[PDB]
Tab-separated table of N, CA and C in Angstrom:
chain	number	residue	atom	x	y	z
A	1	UNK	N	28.802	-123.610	-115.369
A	1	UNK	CA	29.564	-124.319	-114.348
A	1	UNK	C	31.031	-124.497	-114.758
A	2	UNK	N	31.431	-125.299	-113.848
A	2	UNK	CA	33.275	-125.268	-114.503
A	2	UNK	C	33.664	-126.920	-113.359
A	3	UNK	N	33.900	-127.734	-113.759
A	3	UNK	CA	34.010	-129.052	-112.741
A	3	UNK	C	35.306	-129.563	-113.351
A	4	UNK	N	35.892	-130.012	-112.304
A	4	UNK	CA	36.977	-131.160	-112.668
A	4	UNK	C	37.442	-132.657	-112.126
A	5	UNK	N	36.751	-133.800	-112.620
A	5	UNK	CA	36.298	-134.455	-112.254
A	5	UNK	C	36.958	-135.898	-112.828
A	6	UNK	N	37.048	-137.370	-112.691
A	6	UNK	CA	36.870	-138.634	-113.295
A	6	UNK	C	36.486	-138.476	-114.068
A	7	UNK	N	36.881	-139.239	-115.344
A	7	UNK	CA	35.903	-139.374	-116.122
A	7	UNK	C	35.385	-141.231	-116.248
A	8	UNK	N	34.172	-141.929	-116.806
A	8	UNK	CA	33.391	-142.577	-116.525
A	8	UNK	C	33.391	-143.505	-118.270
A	9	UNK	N	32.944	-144.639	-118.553
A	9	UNK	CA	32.715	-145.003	-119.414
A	9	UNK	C	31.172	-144.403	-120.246
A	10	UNK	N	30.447	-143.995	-119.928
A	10	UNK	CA	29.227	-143.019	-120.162
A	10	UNK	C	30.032	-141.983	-121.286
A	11	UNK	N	31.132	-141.144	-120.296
A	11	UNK	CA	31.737	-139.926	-121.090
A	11	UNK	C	32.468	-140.559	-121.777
A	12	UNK	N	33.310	-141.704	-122.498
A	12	UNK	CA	33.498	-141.900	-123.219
A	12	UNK	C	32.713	-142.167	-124.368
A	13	UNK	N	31.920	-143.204	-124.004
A	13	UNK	CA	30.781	-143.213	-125.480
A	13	UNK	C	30.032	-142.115	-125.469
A	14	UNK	N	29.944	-140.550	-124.914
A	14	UNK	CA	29.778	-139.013	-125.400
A	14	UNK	C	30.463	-138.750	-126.121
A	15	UNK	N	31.710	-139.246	-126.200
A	15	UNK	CA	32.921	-138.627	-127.058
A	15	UNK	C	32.939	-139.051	-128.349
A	16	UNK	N	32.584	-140.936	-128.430
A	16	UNK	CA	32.382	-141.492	-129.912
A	16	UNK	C	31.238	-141.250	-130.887
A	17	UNK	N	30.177	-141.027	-130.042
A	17	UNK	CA	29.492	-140.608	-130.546
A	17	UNK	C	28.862	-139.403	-131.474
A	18	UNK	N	29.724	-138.392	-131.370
A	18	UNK	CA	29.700	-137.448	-132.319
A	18	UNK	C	30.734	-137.198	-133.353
A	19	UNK	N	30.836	-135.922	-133.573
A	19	UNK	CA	31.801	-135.704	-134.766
A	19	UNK	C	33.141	-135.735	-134.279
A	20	UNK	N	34.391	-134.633	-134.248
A	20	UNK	CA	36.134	-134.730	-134.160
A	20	UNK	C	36.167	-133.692	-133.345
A	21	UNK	N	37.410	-133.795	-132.818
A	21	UNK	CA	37.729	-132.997	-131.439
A	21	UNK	C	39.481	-132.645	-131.506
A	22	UNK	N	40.124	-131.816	-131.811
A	22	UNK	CA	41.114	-131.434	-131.635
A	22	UNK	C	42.505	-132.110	-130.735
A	23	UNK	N	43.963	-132.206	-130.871
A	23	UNK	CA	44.426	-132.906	-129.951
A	23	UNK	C	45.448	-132.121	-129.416
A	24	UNK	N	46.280	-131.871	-128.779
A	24	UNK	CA	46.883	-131.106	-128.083
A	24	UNK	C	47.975	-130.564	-128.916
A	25	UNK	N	47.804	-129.129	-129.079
A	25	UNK	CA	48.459	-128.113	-130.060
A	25	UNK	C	49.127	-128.998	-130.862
A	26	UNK	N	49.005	-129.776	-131.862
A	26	UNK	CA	49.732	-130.020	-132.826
A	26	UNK	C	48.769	-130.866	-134.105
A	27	UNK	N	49.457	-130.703	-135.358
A	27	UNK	CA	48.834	-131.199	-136.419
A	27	UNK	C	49.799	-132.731	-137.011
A	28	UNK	N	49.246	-133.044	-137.504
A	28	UNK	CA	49.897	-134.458	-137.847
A	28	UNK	C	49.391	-135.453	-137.309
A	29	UNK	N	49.986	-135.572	-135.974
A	29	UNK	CA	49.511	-136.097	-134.848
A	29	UNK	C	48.359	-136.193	-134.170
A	30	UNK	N	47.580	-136.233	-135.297
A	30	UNK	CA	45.577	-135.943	-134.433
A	30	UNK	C	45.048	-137.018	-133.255
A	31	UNK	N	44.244	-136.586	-132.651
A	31	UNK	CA	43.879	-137.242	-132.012
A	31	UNK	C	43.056	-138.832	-131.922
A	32	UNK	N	43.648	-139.523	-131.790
A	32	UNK	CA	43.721	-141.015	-131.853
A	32	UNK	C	43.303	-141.890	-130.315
A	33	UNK	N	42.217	-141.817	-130.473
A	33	UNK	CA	41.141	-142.476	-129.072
A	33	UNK	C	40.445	-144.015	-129.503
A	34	UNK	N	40.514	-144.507	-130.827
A	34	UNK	CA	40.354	-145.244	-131.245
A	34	UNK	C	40.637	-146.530	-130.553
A	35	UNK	N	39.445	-146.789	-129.367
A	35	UNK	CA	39.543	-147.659	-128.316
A	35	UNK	C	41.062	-147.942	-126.919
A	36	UNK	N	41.971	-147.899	-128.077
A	36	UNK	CA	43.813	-147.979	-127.821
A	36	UNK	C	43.762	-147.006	-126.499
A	37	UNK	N	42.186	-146.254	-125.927
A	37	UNK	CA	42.508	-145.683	-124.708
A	37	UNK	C	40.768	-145.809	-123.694
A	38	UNK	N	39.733	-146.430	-125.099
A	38	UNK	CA	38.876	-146.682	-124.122
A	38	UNK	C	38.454	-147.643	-123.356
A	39	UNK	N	38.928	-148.365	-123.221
A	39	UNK	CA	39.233	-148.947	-122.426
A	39	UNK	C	39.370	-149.287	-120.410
A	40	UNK	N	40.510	-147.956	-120.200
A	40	UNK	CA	40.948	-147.487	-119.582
A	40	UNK	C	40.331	-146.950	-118.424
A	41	UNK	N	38.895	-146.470	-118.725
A	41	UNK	CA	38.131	-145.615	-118.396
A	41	UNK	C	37.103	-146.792	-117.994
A	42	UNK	N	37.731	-148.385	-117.663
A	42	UNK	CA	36.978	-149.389	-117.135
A	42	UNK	C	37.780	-149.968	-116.290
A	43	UNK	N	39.283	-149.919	-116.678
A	43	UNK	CA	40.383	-150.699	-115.765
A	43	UNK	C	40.759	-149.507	-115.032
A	44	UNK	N	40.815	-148.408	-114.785
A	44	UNK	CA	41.101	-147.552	-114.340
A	44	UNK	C	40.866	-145.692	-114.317
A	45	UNK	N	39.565	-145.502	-114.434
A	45	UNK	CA	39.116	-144.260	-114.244
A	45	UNK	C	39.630	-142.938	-113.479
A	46	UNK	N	40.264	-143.651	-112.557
A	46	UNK	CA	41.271	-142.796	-111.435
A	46	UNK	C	42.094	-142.042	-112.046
A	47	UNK	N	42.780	-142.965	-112.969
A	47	UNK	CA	43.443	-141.822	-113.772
A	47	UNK	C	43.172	-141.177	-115.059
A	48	UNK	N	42.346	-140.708	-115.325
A	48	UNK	CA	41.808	-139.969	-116.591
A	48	UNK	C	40.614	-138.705	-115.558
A	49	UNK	N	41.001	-137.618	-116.317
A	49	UNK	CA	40.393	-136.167	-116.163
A	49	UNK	C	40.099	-134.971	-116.131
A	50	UNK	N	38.283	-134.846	-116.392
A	50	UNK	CA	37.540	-134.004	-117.909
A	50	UNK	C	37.519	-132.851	-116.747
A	51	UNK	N	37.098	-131.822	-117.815
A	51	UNK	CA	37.298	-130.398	-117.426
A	51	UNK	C	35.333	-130.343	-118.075
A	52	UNK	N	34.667	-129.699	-116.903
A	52	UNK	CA	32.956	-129.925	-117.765
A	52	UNK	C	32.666	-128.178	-117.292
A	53	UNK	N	32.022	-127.130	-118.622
A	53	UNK	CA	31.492	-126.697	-118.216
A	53	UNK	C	30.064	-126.643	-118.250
A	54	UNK	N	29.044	-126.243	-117.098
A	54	UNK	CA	27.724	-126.035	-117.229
A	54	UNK	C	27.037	-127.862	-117.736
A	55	UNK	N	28.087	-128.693	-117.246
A	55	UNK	CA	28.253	-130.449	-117.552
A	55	UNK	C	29.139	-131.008	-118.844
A	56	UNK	N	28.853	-129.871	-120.200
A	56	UNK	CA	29.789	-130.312	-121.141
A	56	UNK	C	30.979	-130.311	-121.225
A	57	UNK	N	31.393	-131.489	-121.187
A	57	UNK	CA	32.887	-131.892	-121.344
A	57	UNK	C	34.071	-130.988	-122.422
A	58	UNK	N	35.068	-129.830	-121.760
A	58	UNK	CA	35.467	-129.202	-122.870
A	58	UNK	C	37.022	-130.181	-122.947
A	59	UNK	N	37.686	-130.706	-122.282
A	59	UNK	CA	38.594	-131.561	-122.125
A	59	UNK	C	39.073	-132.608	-121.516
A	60	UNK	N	40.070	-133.520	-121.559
A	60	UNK	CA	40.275	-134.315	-120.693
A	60	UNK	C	41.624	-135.077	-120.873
A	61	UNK	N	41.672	-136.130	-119.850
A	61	UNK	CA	43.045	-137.003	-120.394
A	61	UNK	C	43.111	-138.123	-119.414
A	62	UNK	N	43.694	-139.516	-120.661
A	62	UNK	CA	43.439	-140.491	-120.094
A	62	UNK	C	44.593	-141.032	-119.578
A	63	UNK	N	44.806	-141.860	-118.789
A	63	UNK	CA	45.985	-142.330	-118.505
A	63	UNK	C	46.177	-143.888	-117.444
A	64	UNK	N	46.947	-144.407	-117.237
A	64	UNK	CA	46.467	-145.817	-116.921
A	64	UNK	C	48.071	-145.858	-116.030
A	65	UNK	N	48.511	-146.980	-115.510
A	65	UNK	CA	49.524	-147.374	-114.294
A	65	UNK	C	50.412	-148.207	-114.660
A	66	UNK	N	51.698	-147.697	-114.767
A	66	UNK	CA	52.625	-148.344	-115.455
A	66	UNK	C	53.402	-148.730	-114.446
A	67	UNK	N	54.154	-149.949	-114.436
A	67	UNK	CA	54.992	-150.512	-113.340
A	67	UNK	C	56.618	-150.679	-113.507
A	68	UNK	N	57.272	-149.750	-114.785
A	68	UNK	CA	58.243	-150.092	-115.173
A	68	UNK	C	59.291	-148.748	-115.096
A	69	UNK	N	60.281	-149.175	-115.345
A	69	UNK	CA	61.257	-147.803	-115.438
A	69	UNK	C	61.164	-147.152	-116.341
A	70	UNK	N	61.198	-147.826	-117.507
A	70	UNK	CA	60.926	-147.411	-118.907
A	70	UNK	C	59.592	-147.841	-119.514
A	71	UNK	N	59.198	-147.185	-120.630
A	71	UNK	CA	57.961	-147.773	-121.493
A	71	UNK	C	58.315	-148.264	-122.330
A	72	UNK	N	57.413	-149.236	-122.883
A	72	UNK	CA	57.596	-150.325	-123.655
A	72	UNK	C	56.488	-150.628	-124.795
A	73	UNK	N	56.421	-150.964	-125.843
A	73	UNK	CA	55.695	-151.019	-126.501
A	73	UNK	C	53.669	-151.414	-126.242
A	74	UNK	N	53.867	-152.184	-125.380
A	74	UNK	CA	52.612	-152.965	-124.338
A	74	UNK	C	52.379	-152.281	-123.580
A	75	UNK	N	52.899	-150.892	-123.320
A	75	UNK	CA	52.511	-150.404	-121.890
A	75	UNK	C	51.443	-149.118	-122.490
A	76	UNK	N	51.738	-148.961	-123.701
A	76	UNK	CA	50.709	-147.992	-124.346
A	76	UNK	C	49.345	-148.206	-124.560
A	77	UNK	N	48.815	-149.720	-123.822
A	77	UNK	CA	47.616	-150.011	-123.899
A	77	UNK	C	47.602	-150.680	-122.745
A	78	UNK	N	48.275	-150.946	-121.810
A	78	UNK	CA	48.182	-151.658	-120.532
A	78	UNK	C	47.719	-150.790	-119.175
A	79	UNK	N	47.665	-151.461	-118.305
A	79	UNK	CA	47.420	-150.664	-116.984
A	79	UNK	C	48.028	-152.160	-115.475
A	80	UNK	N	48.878	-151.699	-115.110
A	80	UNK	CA	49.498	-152.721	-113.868
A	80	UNK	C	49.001	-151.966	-112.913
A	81	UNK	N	48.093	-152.162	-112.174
A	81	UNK	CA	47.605	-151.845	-110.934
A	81	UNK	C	48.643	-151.522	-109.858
A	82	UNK	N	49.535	-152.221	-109.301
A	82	UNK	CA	50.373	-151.976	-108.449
A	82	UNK	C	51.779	-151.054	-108.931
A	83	UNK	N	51.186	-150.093	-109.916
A	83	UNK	CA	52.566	-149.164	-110.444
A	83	UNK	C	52.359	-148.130	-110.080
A	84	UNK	N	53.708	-147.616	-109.805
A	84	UNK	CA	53.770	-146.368	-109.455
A	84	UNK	C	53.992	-144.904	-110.313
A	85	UNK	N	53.903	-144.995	-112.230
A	85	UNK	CA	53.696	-144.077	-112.448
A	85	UNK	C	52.763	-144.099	-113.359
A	86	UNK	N	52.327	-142.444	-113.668
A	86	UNK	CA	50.991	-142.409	-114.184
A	86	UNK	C	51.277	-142.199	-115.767
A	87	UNK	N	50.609	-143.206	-116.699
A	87	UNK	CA	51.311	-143.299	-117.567
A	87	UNK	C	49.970	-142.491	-118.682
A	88	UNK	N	50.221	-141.073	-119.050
A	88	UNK	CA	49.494	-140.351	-120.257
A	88	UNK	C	49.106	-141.344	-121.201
A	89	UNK	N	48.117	-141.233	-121.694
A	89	UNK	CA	47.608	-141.577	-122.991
A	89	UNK	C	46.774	-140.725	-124.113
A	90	UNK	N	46.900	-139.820	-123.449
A	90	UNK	CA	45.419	-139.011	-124.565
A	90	UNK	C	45.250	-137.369	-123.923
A	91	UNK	N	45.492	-136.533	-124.239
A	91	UNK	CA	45.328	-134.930	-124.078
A	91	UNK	C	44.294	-134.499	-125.063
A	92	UNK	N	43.050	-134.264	-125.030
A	92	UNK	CA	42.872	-133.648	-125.656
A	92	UNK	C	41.838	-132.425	-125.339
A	93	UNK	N	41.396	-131.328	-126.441
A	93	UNK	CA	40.552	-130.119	-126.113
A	93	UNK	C	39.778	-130.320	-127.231
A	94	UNK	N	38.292	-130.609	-126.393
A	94	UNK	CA	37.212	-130.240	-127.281
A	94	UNK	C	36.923	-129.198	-127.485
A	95	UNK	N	35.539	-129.354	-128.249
A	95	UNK	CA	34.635	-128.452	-129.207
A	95	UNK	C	35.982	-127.166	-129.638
A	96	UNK	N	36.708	-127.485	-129.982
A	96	UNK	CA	38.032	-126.624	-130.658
A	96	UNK	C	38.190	-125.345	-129.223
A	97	UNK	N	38.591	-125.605	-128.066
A	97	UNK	CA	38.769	-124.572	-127.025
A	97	UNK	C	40.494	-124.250	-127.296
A	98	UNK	N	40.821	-124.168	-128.617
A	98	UNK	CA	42.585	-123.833	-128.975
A	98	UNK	C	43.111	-123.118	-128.436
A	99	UNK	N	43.975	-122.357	-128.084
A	99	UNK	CA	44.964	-121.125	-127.645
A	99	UNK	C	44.265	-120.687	-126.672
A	100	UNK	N	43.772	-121.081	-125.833
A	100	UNK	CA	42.915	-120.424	-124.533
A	100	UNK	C	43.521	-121.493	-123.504
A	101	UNK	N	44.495	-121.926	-123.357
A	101	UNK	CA	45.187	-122.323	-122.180
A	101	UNK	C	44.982	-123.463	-121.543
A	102	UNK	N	43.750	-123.694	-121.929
A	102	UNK	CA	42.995	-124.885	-121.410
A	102	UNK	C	43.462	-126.300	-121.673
A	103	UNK	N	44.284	-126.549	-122.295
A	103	UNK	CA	45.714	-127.809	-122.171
A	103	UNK	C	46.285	-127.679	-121.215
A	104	UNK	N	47.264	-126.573	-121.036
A	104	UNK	CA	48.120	-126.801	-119.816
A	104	UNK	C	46.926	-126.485	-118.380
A	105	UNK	N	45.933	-126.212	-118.319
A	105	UNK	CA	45.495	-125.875	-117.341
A	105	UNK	C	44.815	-127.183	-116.404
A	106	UNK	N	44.842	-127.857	-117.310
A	106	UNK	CA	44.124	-129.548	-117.460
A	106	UNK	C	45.405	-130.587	-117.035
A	107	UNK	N	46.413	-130.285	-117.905
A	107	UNK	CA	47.686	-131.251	-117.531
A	107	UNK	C	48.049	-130.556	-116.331
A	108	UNK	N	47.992	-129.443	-115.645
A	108	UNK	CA	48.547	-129.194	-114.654
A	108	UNK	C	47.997	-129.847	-113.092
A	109	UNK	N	46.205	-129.599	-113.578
A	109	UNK	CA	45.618	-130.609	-112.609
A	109	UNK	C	45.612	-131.768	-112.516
A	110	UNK	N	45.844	-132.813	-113.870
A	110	UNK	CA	45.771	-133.504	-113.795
A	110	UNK	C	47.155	-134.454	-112.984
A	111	UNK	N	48.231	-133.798	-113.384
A	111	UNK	CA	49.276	-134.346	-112.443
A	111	UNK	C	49.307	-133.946	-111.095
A	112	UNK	N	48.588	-133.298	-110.406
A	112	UNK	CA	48.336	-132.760	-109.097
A	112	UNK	C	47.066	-133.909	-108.347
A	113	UNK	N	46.193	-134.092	-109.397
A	113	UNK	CA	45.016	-135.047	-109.358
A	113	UNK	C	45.928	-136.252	-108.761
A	114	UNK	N	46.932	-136.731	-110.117
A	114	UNK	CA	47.603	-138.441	-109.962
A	114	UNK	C	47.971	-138.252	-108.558
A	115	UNK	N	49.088	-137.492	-108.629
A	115	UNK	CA	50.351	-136.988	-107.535
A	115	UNK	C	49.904	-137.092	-105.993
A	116	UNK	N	48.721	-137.086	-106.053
A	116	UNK	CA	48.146	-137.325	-104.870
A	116	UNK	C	47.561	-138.254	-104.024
A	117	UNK	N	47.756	-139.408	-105.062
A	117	UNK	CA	47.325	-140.633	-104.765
A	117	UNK	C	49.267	-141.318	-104.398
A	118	UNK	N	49.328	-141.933	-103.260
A	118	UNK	CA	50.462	-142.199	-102.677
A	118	UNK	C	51.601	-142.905	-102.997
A	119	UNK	N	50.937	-143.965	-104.224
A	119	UNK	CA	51.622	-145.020	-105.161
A	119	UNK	C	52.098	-144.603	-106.460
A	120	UNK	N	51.440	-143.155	-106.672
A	120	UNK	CA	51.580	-142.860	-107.974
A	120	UNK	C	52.875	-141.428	-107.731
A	121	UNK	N	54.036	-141.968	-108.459
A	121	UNK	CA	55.621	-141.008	-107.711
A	121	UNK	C	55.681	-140.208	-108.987
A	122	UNK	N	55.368	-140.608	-109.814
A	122	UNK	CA	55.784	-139.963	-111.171
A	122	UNK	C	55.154	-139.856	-112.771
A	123	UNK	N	55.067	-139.020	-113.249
A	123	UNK	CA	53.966	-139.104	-114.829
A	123	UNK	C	55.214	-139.853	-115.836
A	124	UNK	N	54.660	-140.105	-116.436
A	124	UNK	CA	55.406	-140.801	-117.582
A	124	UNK	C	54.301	-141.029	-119.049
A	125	UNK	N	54.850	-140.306	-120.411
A	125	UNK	CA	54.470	-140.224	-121.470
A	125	UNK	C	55.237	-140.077	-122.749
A	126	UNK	N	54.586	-140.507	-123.906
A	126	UNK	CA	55.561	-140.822	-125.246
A	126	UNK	C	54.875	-139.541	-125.804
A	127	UNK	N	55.709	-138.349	-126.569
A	127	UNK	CA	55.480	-137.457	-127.445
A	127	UNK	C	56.587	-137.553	-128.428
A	128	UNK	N	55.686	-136.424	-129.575
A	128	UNK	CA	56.569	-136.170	-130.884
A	128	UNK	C	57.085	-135.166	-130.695
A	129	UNK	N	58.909	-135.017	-131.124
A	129	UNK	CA	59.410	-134.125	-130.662
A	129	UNK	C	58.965	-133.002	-130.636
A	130	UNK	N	58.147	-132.523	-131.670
A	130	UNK	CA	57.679	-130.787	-131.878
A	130	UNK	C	57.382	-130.804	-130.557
A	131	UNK	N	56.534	-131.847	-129.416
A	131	UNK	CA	55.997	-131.227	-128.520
A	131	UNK	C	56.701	-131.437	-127.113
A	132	UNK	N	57.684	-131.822	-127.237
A	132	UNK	CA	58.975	-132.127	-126.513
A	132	UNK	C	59.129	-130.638	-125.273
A	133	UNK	N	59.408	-129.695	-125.631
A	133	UNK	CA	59.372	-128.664	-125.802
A	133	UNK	C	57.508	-128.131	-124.240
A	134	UNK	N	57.003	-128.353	-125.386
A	134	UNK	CA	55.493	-128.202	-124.490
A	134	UNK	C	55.641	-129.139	-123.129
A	135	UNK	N	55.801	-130.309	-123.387
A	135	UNK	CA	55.647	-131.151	-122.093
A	135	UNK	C	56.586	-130.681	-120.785
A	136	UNK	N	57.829	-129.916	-121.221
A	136	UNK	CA	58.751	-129.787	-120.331
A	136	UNK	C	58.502	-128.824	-119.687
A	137	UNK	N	57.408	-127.548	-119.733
A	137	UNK	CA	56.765	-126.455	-119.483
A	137	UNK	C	55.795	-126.910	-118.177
A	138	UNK	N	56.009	-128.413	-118.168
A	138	UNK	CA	55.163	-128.915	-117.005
A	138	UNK	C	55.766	-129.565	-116.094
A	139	UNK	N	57.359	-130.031	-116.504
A	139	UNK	CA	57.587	-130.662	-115.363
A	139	UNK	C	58.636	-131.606	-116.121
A	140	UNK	N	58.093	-131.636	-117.447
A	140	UNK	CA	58.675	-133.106	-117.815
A	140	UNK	C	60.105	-133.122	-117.889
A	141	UNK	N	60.586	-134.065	-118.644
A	141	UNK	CA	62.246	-134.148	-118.958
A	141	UNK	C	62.629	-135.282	-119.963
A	142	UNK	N	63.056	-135.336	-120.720
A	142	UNK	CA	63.472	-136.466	-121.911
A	142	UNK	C	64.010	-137.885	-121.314
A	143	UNK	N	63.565	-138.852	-120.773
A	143	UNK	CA	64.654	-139.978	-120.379
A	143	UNK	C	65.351	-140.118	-121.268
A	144	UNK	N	64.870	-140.580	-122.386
A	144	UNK	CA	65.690	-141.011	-123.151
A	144	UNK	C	65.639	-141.517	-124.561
A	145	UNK	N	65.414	-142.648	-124.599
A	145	UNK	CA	65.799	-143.648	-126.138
A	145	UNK	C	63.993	-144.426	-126.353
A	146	UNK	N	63.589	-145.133	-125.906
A	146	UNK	CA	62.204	-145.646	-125.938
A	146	UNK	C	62.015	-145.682	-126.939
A	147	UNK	N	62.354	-146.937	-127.963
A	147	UNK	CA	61.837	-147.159	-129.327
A	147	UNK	C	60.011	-147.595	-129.180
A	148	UNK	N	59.245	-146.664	-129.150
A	148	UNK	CA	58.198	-147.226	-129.166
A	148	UNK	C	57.294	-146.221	-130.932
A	149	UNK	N	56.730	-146.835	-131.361
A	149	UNK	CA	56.724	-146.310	-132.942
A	149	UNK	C	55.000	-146.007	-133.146
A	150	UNK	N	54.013	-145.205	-132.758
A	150	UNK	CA	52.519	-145.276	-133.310
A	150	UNK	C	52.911	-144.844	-134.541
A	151	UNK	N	52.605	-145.390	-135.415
A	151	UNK	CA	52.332	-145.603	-136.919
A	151	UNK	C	53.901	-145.771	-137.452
A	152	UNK	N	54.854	-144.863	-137.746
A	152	UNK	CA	55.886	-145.205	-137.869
A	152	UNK	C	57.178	-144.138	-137.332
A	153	UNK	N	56.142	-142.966	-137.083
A	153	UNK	CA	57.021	-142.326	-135.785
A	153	UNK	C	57.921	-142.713	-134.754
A	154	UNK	N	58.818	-141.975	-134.630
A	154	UNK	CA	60.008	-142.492	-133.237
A	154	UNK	C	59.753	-141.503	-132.266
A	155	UNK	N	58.831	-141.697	-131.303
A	155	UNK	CA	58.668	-140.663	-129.918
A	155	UNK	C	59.646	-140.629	-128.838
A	156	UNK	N	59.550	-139.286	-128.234
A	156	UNK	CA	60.662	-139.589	-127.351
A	156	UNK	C	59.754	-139.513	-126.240
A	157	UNK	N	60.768	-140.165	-125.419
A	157	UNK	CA	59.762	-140.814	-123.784
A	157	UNK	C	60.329	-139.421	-122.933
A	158	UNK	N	59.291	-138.753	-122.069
A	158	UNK	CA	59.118	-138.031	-121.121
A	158	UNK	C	58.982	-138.677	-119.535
A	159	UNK	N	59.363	-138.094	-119.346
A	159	UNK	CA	59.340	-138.558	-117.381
A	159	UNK	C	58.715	-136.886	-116.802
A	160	UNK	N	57.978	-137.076	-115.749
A	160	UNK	CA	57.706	-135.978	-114.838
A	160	UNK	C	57.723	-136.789	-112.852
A	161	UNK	N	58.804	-136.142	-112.153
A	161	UNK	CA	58.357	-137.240	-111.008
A	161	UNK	C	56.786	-135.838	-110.635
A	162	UNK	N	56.656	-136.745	-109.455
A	162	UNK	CA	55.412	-135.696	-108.456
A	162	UNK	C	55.994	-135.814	-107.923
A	163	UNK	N	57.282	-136.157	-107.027
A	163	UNK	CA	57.892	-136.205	-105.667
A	163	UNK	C	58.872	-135.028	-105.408
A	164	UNK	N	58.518	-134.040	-104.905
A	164	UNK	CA	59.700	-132.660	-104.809
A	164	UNK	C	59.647	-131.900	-103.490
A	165	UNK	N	60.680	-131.601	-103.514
A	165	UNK	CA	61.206	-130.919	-102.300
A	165	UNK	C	60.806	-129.321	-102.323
A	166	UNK	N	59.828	-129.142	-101.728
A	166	UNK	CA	59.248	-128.061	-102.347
A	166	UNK	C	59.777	-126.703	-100.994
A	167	UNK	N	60.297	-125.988	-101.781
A	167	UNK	CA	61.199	-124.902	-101.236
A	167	UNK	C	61.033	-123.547	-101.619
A	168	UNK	N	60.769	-123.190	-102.795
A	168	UNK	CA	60.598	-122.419	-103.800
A	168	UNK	C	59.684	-122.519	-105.233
């Protein structure tokens, strides 16, 4: 099979429950689900979503509703219901599905997924520069400054709107 779907608090405790899972093309930076996103997948399921084939989950991504211009240290674990952008938390590709496309093929739906819900104008996410680069291949663009620090890293904040004048 091949589904693309919500994901559910069920598929999260699938995920803790076993061994490690890869995080979106980069090393250093591993993948870090360590509640700081499960959460999410109770306050807001709408925005997080798995890629299943034949039912097993080969990817997914979580993300929650931010109400601000900028991100802020609190917003990396928050969710404001009445916001209008969709704020990334988590990319990742299981059972090691690496260099087979299946990242961008996932972030591409998945901002098509948000984008479609009427309140939600724009993606918004914190990366490390190496992947600065990758995110912009989708849409994104650097705002700016966003001192926000996981562990002691300085990320730079990404913006993507969904709102475009579509012409070409």
């Amino acid at each position: 099979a091949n589904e693309f779907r919500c994901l559910t608090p069920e598929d999260a405790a699938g995920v803790f429950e076993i061994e490690r899972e890869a995080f979106i093309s980069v090393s250093g930076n591993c993948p870090l689900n360590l509640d700081e996103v499960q959460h999410f997948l109770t306050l807001c399921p709408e925005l997080s979503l798995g890629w299943f084939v034949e039912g097993r989950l080969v990817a997914f991504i979580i993300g929650s509703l931010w109400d601000e211009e900028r991100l802020t240290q609190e917003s990396l674990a928050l969710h404001r219901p009445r916001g209008h952008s969709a704020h990334l938390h988590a990319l990742a590709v299981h059972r090691s599905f690496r260099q087979q496309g299946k990242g961008s093929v996932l972030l591409w739906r998945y901002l098509h997924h948000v984008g479609a819900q009427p309140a939600v104008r724009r993606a918004v996410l914190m990366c490390e520069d190496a992947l600065v680069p990758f995110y912009q291949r989708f849409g994104f663009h650097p705002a700016g400054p966003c001192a926000i620090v996981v562990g002691s890293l300085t990320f730079t904040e990404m913006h993507c709107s969904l709102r475009g004048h579509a012409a070409l």
